[PDB]
């Protein structure tokens, strides 16, 4: 009995939204607006905008209009544009994917063979990804129902070019006035006082050759042995090897003010990741008629080592990847590399018992060890008992009818968290000579020309503290007590459940930064405090059929939980980190709760300013912050609890429809009544809320309160944030309630009597779409409310596909 399973998928992917930025036109508006608002002359701007403007009879300023020269440039080398910079670096995406699998199974042995291909032209320009894979599984019965040895194997090859770090984000604060290409059709960029930021599209080109290649083998071999009846121990060993190589080309560039001084260079990177596992597991089980058991005992070792190293060379005579290998360099060089590793051991065991399919029970104990910790606390033991009671099966609730199943579970299960830095426990000193790039300085290098020779050779090096160690660190423990009800009603058409969890985490591991006097390297993995997390979930569905063969199944979900911090080292509550922004200790509050000032709108009147408490940079048009002191000054004590990321509740619903061979299925997820806090509003609502001047800004600051536009919530435009508008305020909290069609999928299934005509069994086409539409609240300023720190949404997928199945 051989089975063949073929699959295929094209998928298109598009951005459907983004934070609207300034036109080259609007930009000139806003800059002028900020200039006149601040009462300084908007024709002494450094960007070359020409304004003609005047007063609107009430005596207020009005813009009449705007002329730029043809070139941004004293020498006509760079021309003004209206670059839609996000559109220049964006593409539609297309995914192609195929998967072929053959499966022979004998009553002696069996074997599987897969072969897949995936190729993903990305939604960014000059970035792709593809991936071949082949699976080869098999097993062999060497004695009839007594002894068997098996294997599992998978092989992958992968090739990508990647977007640099946040180009999209760099693509939205580059002014649209900057032209992609310059006059000669070279690459274009800033000039003069225009903000110092490199043409995203240029970057994407210069980076189109930085491609890596990655391989992966993983799988296991096992022998399963079964002496006499109902008992079988088995051992398995498995491995996982991976390797990543790439060359990273630096080419030169002069793009206006954006120079590189002609530096060329390549870095060849290599990375290896090697993991292996061996276990052994005995499993007896009994069943004397009415009485059932499962006992299980085993142990499993794991070890991971990984390492990475790098060769970097400067100065090439031919700016291509054929010539630009390190051997061909003619300038200075650098080498880099290191490795880390860890290992884990696990002894364990399982209990399983039942009566006449009625009163059940299971126990589990396990002892876990980890390389990460000192010898002091290296192990720790996690017990876990759960029991259940299928109650319709009881010999008295039998009449009942209408209901067909009703169980009643209850868990109490400890569990361990170990995932931290492999070097958690050491005061680490490293000999940072200074061989490595760094933005702005801050090398943190141990080298120094002690002789005063300006150098010309190797320099005295040293060591430097990267961390402080705690040899008292230990595991983290989550005690999760569970309780619920499985149920199923009217002729198995009404089903659902009803749980109540209560997780409780103890000795939570984070890495704490240091107090500032402690100085460099003060930073260490501590266990700090505990936290509670208990809620209620509810699932319920109805499925049925109709006369006109319509089968449907609506399954819904409603979730709700609360979360509280129970205890924090004084130093750790005092510094924020879990909330309270270092004004208010977060104990007895929700994990991630924040604290800031509360914003009472805009001053619309010198009187509003005057009979308001003293505020530093308050004037008409600035944000009015309230006096929770009620003491007449605003200082810094005037701030309470303004953010709380716990949802009020969360809900989901799945839909399945079947009719006349068709196959429809939708998936809706949502959350009601959450808060959200973001930064994006420093880019959409102020000229002057960031460290670098003149970057491109959002689109709703055009709606800024002004004489000529009162009754606006967005504060006025100014050249220098003097009301400290960008303090932590309710301004930056919005409602992120939402509802999101996730996936929706239609499918046609060729009827079986004519699929066989061309020799098949299951032939089905389908169309799907992920991330289709969202529904936000009117109080949200936009771009996917469940990731509010992004000025762009997740891109939409649309997929055509078919699943053949001879």
């Amino acid at each position: 009995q051989i089975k063949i399973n073929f699959d295929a998928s094209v998928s298109a992917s598009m951005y459907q939204s983004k934070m609207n930025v300034l036109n080259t036109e609007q930009y000139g508006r806003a800059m002028w607006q900020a200039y006149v608002n601040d009462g300084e002359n908007p024709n002494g701007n450094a960007l070359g905008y020409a304004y003609n403007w005047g007063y609107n009879a009430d005596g207020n300023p009005v813009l009449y209009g705007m002329t730029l020269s043809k070139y941004l440039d004293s020498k006509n080398t760079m021309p003004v544009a209206d670059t839609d910079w996000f559109d220049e670096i964006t593409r539609t995406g297309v995914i192609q994917q195929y998967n072929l699998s053959v499966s022979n199974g004998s009553e002696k042995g069996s074997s599987f063979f897969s072969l897949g291909y995936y190729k993903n032209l990305g939604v960014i320009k000059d970035t792709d990804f593809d991936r071949f894979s082949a699976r080869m599984n098999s097993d062999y019965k060497l004695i009839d129902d007594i002894l068997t040895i098996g294997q599992h194997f998978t092989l992958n090859r992968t090739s990508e070019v990647q977007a640099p770090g946040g180009i999209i984000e760099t693509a939205l604060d580059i002014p649209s006035a900057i032209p992609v290409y310059a006059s000669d059709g070279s690459w274009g960029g800033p000039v003069g006082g225009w903000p110092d930021r490199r043409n995203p599209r240029a970057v994407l080109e210069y980076n189109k050759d930085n491609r890596y290649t990655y391989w992966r083998m993983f799988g296991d071999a096992y022998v399963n042995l079964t002496p006499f009846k109902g008992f079988n121990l088995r051992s398995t060993f498995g491995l996982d090897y991976a390797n990543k190589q790439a060359r990273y080309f630096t080419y030169p560039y002069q793009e206006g003010t954006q120079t590189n001084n002609g530096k060329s260079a390549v870095e060849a990177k290599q990375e290896h990741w090697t993991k292996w596992m061996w276990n052994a597991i005995a499993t007896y089980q009994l069943e004397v008629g009415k009485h059932r058991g499962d006992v299980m005992i085993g142990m499993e070792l794991n070890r991971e080592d990984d390492s990475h190293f790098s060769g970097y060379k400067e100065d090439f005579s031919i700016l291509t990847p054929d010539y630009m290998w390190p051997d061909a360099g003619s300038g200075t060089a650098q080498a880099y590399g290191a490795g880390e590793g860890y290992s884990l051991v696990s002894f364990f065991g399982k209990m399983n018992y039942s009566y006449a399919d009625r009163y059940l029970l299971s126990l589990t104990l396990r002892r876990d060890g980890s390389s990460r910790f000192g010898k002091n606390h290296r192990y720790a033991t996690f017990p876990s008992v759960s029991l259940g009671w299928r109650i319709t099966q009881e010999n008295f609730m039998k009449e009942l009818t209408w209901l067909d199943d009703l169980k009643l579970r209850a868990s109490w299960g400890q569990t361990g968290n170990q995932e931290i830095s492999n070097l958690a426990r050491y005061t680490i000193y490293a000999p940072n000579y200074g061989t490595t790039d760094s933005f702005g300085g801050q090398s943190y290098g141990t080298a120094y020309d002690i002789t005063g020779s300006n150098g010309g050779g190797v320099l005295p090096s040293g060591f430097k503290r990267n961390q402080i160690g705690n040899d008292n660190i230990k595991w983290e423990t989550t005690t999760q007590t569970n309780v619920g009800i499985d149920f199923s009603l009217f002729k198995q058409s009404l089903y659902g459940s009803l749980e109540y969890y209560y997780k409780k985490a103890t000795d939570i591991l984070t890495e704490m930064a240091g107090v500032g006097v402690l100085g460099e390297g003060g930073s260490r993995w501590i266990n700090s405090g505990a936290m509670k997390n208990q809620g209620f979930e509810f699932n319920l569905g109805y499925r049925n059929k109709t006369a006109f063969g319509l089968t449907y199944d609506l399954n819904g979900n409603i979730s709700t939980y609360r979360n509280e911090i129970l205890e924090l080292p004084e130093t750790v509550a005092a510094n924020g980190k879990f909330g309270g922004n270092g004004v208010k200790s977060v104990v007895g509050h929700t994990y991630g709760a924040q604290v800031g000032y509360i914003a009472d709108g805009i001053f619309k009147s010198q009187d509003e300013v005057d009979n308001h408490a003293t505020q530093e940079g308050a004037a008409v048009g600035r944000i009015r912050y309230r006096d929770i002191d009620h003491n007449g000054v605003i200082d810094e004590r005037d701030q309470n609890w303004i953010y709380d990321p716990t949802p009020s509740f969360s809900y989901g619903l799945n839909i399945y429809l079947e009719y006349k061979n068709f196959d429809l299925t939708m998936f809706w997820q949502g959350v009601q009544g959450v808060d959200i806090i973001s930064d994006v509003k420093k880019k959409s609502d102020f000229w002057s809320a960031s460290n670098v001047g003149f970057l491109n800004k959002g689109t709703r600051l055009l709606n800024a309160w002004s004489p000529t536009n009162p009754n606006s919530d967005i504060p006025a435009l100014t050249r220098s944030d003097t009301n400290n508008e960008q303090r932590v305020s309710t301004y930056f909290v919005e409602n992120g309630s939402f509802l999101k069609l996730r996936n929706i999928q239609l499918g046609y299934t060729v009827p079986a009597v004519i699929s066989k005509k061309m020799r098949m069994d299951r032939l089905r086409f389908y169309c799907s779409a992920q991330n289709l539409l969202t529904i936000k609240s009117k109080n949200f300023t936009g771009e996917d409310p469940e990731n509010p720190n992004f000025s762009y949404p997740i891109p939409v997928n649309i997929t055509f596909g078919l699943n053949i199945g001879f």
Partner: protein, 553 residues
Amino acid sequence: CDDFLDRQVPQGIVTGDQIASPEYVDNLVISAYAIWATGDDINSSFSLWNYDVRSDDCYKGGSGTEDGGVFNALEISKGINTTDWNINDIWKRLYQCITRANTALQSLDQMDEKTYPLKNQRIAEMRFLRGHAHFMLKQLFKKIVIVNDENMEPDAYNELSNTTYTNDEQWQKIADDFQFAYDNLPEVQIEKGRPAQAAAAAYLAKTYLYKAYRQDGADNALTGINEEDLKQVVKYTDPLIMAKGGYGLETDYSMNFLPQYENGAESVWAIQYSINDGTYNGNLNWGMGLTTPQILGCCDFHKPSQNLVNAFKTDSQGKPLFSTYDNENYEVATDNVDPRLFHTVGMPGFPYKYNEGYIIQKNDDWSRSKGLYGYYVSLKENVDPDCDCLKKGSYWASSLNHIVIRYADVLLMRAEALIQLNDGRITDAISLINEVRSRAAGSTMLIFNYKEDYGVNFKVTPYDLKAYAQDEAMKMLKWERRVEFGMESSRFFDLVRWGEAKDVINAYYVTEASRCSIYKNAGFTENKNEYLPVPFEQISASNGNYTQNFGWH
């Protein structure tokens, strides 16, 4: 199976117990000198040019006021917040210096002098570094933490408090270190990176000076001038010590700011920026990364104020115009000028750092702001563009050494303490002033042709060794310091020492508002703005142990 989780060890690492081993100890010493070249940032130079834009010497610079917006607030004295990232930064960073000095002392202290016959010499070096840090920390904040117990365990740091000592008692602890350094440094260092004995002296003095203008009250106003403090400033500036180390004034002022004369006889102690040295792009002075002229394409910060350009004007008697300098802007062809200008301020119509194939103009190529912040360039931290010592990484940087103590500082400080003593040694203080002034007089190397080719009329004359009133001798002392240290970040600090911070800065705020428009809504709050606030992040994280600065609560 426990023989399994011990098999792996850290790679490329010294763990903590081993760092104490002595083979690593000259590594630790050097690592502490290093950070001074490798631990600053574009926005947070350890030269503190950033936070001297408050002074009447310089404008922020850059595109406009929306660019580095938090330094514009400082420049004008409005909008400064106890949470501004830049201040919390300079704090965190200068205490990062200290970690290295104390890590080194925590092993130096545990050596064997018989084995290490340089123990006391290299303890003086580390303590001297630790001084240098606290001093700048005291200048910028006043109410600092004193971290000077090298054996202090990590958790002892949570209970540290910045109030533990008083104002005089904090200055005294900053003295206690340089005093040790003086009593244990050699009279010459064959490696110029290490301070010589005279270097620990000058600092020792400078520390006593700032300690002499006592602010022994609750607010930042003067509470009296201590003469025992001033007697100490006259002590450790004695020329008999400075001869013992070979120090003195250069033949020509410009020599202190040219790569061709690093480590001359005026460089009492300097940071050793270097290139071609194994580092990714050089141990360059990346702190002046913003203050490179716009001709290189970025970023035109640290622009010199007209108020400074004018203060070089002199009458026909070769003296400053003490009460008339700012009335009319410096006019090249009529005014007698002090030569020191053309080494401090690069002016339009003139060569940028002597290279007369780069003449400064009034155009996009020389002002990132279209004239908002002016058309002047700071010359001291910048160099010839044709230098083989200027590279471009993220910003443009050189290997030009940054001097911490010029011997002129020694002379003027000595004159200052003398004048303020009024023990008849006013004449001696004048004679010291004349050493520095008569030097600047002849300094027409590199600019001699300027007379004919640009019509500049040099004329500087020393003062007559007669009697002078203590208020009169201070007047001239202050002026020499103004012209001698243009754009060297001492200026704001000098007025706060003198206690005339509010009076001078506000007066600069009105005169200059007709010439720079960012200075229109400006104003120095007295008893508040003498010192930055203590960073909220820090006060917040001290769980009650830290006290804010006066007038910030």
